[PDB]
Amino acid sequence: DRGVFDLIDDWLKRDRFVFVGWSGLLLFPCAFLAVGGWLTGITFVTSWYTHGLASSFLEGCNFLTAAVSTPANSMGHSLLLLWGPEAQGDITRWFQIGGLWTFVALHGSFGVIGFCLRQFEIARLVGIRPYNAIAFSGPIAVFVTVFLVYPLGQASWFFAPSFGVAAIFRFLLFLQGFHNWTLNPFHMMGVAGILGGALLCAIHGATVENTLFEDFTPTQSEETYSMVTANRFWSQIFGVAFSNKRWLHFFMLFVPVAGMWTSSLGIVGLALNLRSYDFVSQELRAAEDPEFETFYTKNNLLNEGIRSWMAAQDQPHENFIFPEEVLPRGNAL
Amino acid sequence: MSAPNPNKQPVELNRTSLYWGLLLIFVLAVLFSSYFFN
Amino acid sequence: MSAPNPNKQPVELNRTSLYWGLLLIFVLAVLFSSYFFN
Amino acid sequence: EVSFGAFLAVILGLFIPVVFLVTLYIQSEAQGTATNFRLPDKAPGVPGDRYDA
Amino acid sequence: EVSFGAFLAVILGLFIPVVFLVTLYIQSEAQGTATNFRLPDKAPGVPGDRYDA
Amino acid sequence: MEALVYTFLLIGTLIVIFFAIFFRDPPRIVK
Amino acid sequence: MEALVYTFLLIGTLIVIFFAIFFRDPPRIVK
Amino acid sequence: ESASFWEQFCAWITSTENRLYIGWFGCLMFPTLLTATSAYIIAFIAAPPVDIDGIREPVAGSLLYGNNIISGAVVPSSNAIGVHFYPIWEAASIDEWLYNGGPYQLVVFHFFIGVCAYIGREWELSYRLGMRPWICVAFSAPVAAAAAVFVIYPIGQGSFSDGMPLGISGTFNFMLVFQAEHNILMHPFHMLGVAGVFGGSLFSAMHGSLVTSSLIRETSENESLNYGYKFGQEEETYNIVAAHGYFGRLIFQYASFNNSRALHFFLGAWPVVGIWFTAMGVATMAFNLNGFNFNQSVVDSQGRVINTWADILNRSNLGMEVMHERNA
Amino acid sequence: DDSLGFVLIGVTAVIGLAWAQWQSYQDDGDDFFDTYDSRRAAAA
Amino acid sequence: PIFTFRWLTIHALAVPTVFFLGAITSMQFIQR
Amino acid sequence: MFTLKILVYTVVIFFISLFTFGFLSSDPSRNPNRKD
Amino acid sequence: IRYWIIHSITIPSLFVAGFLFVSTGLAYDAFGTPRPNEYFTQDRQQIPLVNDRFSAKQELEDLTKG
Amino acid sequence: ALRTRLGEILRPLNAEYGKVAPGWGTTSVMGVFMALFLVFLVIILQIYNSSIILENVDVDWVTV
Amino acid sequence: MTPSLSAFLSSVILAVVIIVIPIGAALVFVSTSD
Ligand SMILES: C=Cc1c(C)c2cc3nc(c4c5[nH]c(cc6nc(cc1[nH]2)C(C)=C6CC)c(C)c5C(=O)[C@@H]4C(=O)OC)[C@@H](CCC(=O)OC/C=C(\C)CCC[C@H](C)CCC[C@H](C)CCCC(C)C)[C@@H]3C
Ligand SMILES: CC(C)=CCC/C(C)=C/CC/C(C)=C/CC/C(C)=C/CC/C(C)=C/CC/C(C)=C/CC/C(C)=C/CC/C(C)=C/CC/C(C)=C/CC1=CC(=O)C(C)=C(C)C1=O
Ligand SMILES: CCCCCCCCCCCCCCCC(=O)OC[C@H](COP(=O)(O)OC[C@@H](O)CO)OC(=O)CCCCCCCCCCCCCCC
Ligand SMILES: CC1=C(/C=C/C(C)=C/C=C/C(C)=C/C=C/C=C(C)/C=C/C=C(C)/C=C/C2=C(C)CCCC2(C)C)C(C)(C)CCC1
Ligand SMILES: [Fe+2]
């Protein structure tokens, strides 16, 4: 248009094979480095000096067991920059101390910021409301709390999840054994939103496909399915039914997104070990009365079994020499 | 200045929204009562 | 029959009656709290 | 010895009638009948005009 | 030991928002805006017509 | 005392569900 | 916590009195 | 010439004017589901502890016996019963019936019959209303998951004590014991189920935000936009081309599901197929076809075992397993 | 009662006679050539 | 050679992918 | 108890027979596209 | 067709370069990944873990030597 | 609208609604201060993170 | 000037020199060209 800023603005918003925009200056390099850094780590970089594990394709791992493992516990919450005082420019030592994890997590953090900015930018360019950006704040809150806020409250980056399939599976059982994360009401609200979102996806797609009108042309001014028939069906099957199409689609937004946001609030509490581990009255009752036993008390026994049997190898920086007599067993109870 | 305020608006809450609110509050109480009591 | 009921009537409570009820309930609570607590 | 039942008697014995009076007045404001400075009902269900009008 | 403050948390945590929702709906019924099966507002402060007249 | 509160909460939830089913806003088709 | 309840009740009564005085229904003379 | 009583009964049962449709499938659904509902409520509120293990150590599951809503459950049947049919009339006393976990069998069997009849009832109402009958196929996936978790896993393991308890903490206990014994996390079918559930939430939020974003202006300022849609209207309530252009520019030039039919088919199909596969994974793990075992997969030149993340997962599984196998 | 088969036989008889009463005034003797029978004699 | 966006972007993905694919293939011939 | 078994048996058989004889009562005709 | 004939030589060149990067052991030295014969040494039978933050570079060098 | 003694006093402070500097104004100076603020925030973060270790600065609890 | 401080200064200079300035110059060139 007028100035040099206007030509750059016109070039970035030009209709090409992939939209760039101003957010693409932040999204495209950060997302490419995070994904490229993750693919580099699962292929070549080991976790031998941080976890005592082999976690790369070079060492014999497959796609399920390879991971970009977290830094060593001695690193603390260091940013672990390549030029930082830990690696001092040595990229080989940087890979061995787990600096690739902070590389993927930090560039991935600015990647999801750039993607949400991209959602805002395209919505303003097309001219629609920015509800996709609000819906993406759910995954942003989950990524920020789990991969950044939770290790920042813990001892080090070591206790964050590692970028891998089986490594994430360990992180699930770690938070169950150490925090009783299933008993947290914030995770329960998260399960309700995520399972409810899958229900809403299945039930809405089936209803539209089955209340279809006998005739989708892209420029169809009329609706392709009968809302009256769909409302009549679910009112007699379930008792209640949607009657507003706009409320039905806000609800499809709200339920899974609120599940991500509610579970993220509990992870923040888990960062400071403010966990919902026990019911004190039920724990006191089982102490005085050994015959007393509920499913919650049986679960706390399994949490003790998780903690003591993994701690020797899950946290190798600490020695944790546990003899067989102190290892909890249901047999010798 | 003790004049009729033009920004005054009526407030609505239809029966569906009332049922959603009652269900949300009752289910939240059901979920959090065990944690509050212990 | 589910006809429109002609005996339906609106219910009225002016601000003076609201203030009288609030004063009565608060004063009754003030009077009886000492006896309930002991 | 904080009597637990006595606390609920004071709280719920105050909250519930206050709520009932507040709810009655608010729907009275919506119907335009929350003032005593208005004429008697013109018709069944139709409140009279206010004195200021 | 019955946690005294926990009883108020369950009771007042349930009663107060239920009261707020019930009070909002009742005054909405007085204004004829407590149904979603009505047209949008024809004017500011004037609710739209119901679908069945 | 706690079990009474739990039972009251669950029964109240079921009452709310009953009212939401049978005393719902009747759907009217726009003309 | 009994004294807290007593103080809350007395202050609430005074608040109700304040609202009844200064936010009363304004008297209008009929014409 | 008068109408027979059976004709009036058939007219009332299959009537579309009832507030809740009954139908012939509902003739099985309503008494079974109301039986299981009242029995579950009674057993949840007040029921004596059930000796699930079979060795005279009972587990309390009712509210009146000292547990809350989270820890409350209808405890599964006793290990002494196994997969034996245990009705209330085959027990010597009501006390012995409640001691052996009979309420679990009653509630589970009535609930299973009720949800199968619910599938049939969904088809039935779809038939009476003249619509396409595949909502019941979509509901067949959570029904399959419930069947695998309540009936089929006890069949494979040989005891209804191994079924999922009808409670929250009991569900978590079932999940932990199942992971310890079968490694469901490393099963490909549970990966497909997690992909289905995560993707279903993604697609639900995506579709909802896309429709909510492109709503056509029909209301005034700060009024709820939901009044812009009229129930029974023919015209579209949102701008489909604007949402398609946004979704196209979001990822790559032409990626929007331009045909809404296949978009909604994909929405209805993805989590249903995922839940089908995770139900079949749970059902196949009942017969000891466990998940992937990548234990001791990395060794050095001298034969020493280098652990992987699967080894740490196995250590967690071993801890849960040794705390579950009470004097094996 | 005693052998539990009379409960089975007795109940399906009672509902069976009600169904047979409905079936009596059904003009289904003639055979149709269609995917389903749309003929249902509703008395009232 | 140099397109405005396309040549640099698709070569930023294709060049490391083929190099990685050759590296993955060589790992299958390592005896451990 | 034998009486409870008798009552449950007759209730179950009653509802099953309702289902069975209802689906035999010309069910495919009970559809809105019925040809008169 | 001119770009196809240069892709016919560069794609095999890049695939061979990735193949030789692993088969010659250059991938182990570049990334610090230990070979199967150097997970443990004669003087170190335990898992080599970094115990200090700011001496991590020196600690890795006095432990991976030889 | 009501005119008060304090309202007449504060009147020139709210009398410049919609007044702008034409064009880009002082955006170039603002971007420099934003860039300097970003570098400053990274410095004090890396000092706290011990990614920058200064000469006589020890990030630990101090006495007196 | 400690090695960590010098490394930080080199990182800032490097980011400006090989990331911000080349991308901005390329953007200006392709915006004026196209
Ligand atoms: C595990 C589950 C999961 C995954 C993998 C996922 C993935 C995705 N969702 C997206 C979108 C969305 N997801 C949404 C809601 C949801 N998403 C959910 C769950 C998920 N969503 C749930 C549960 C919801 C419901 C609230 C919405 C509303 C959107 C979108 O609008 C967006 C979209 O367009 O979808 C069509 C895309 C973001 C693209 C992007 O940022 O590119 C840029 C690339 C970046 C930023 C790189 C990220 C780097 C990450 C953070 C760290 C590195 C990770 C490694 C590369 C891989 C590690 C893998 C191991 C851990 C196993 C991507 C396909
Ligand atoms: C004695 C007793 C009772 C004992 C029981 C003990 C016990 C186990 C108690 C249960 C406790 C309990 C309820 C726990 C749950 C607590 C908990 C986790 C609460 C979550 C709270 C919360 C705030 C979570 C945040 C996430 C969130 C918002 C989740 C909400 C999930 C939710 C309600 C989803 C909707 C589910 C659902 C069934 C929707 C179907 C909608 C439907 C009918 C659509 C059909 C339809 C489709 C169409 O396409 C069209 C077109 C039309 C027209 C149409 O109609
Ligand atoms: C689960 C169980 C739920 C139970 C909830 C219980 C709700 C019960 C609440 C109702 C009682 C309160 C309603 C009063 C509301 C009220 O009083 O309104 C005043 C009302 C005004 O009458 P009008 O006919 O003018 O009112 C027109 C309408 O506006 C009234 O609705 O007169 C009366 O009701 C007559 C009784 C006079 C009573 C005077 C009492 C004042 C006593 C003094 C106060 C104490 C001060 C002491 C100082 C020493
Ligand atoms: C870290 C780092 C960095 C970065 C780097 C990068 C950026 C990289 C990239 C990388 C990359 C970028 C790579 C890639 C790779 C790829 C691959 C590895 C692929 C593979 C593939 C495959 C394997 C496939 C498969 C399949 C599927 C998936 C489906 C269908 C079937 C098939 C089979 C075909 C730097 C330098 C800055 C420095 C610092 C450090
Ligand atoms: Fe839709």
Could you walk me through the main structural features you see in this protein, from its secondary elements to its overall organization?
The structure is cut from a larger assembly and holds 14 protein chains of eleven kinds. Chain H has about 325 residues and is mainly alpha-helical. Helix content of chain H is about 55%, strand content about 0%. Chain H is built from ten helices and two strands; from the N terminus they run H-H-E-H-H-H-E-H-H-H-H-H. A two-stranded antiparallel sheet of chain H has the order 1-2. The longest helix of chain H is centred in the middle third of the chain and has 27 residues, at about 100-130. Chain I is built from one helix and no strands. Chain I is elongated. Helix content of chain J is about 70%, strand content about 0%. The longest helix of chain J is centred in the middle third of the chain and has 22 residues, at about 5-25. The radius of gyration of chain J is 14 Å and the shape is rod-shaped. Chain N is mainly α and about 35 residues long. Chain N is built from one helix and no strands. Chain N has one helix spanning about 5-34. The radius of gyration of chain N is 14 Å and the shape is rod-shaped. The interface of A and E includes residues 244 and 247 of A. Pheophytin A sits at the interface of chains A and H. The PDB classes it as photosynthesis. The entry lists the keywords photosystem II, photosynthesis, chlorophyll, light-harvesting complex, energy transfer, lhcii, fcpii, coccolithophore, haptophyte. PSII-FCPII supercomplex from haptophyte Chrysotila roscoffensis. Chain A is Photosystem II D2 protein.
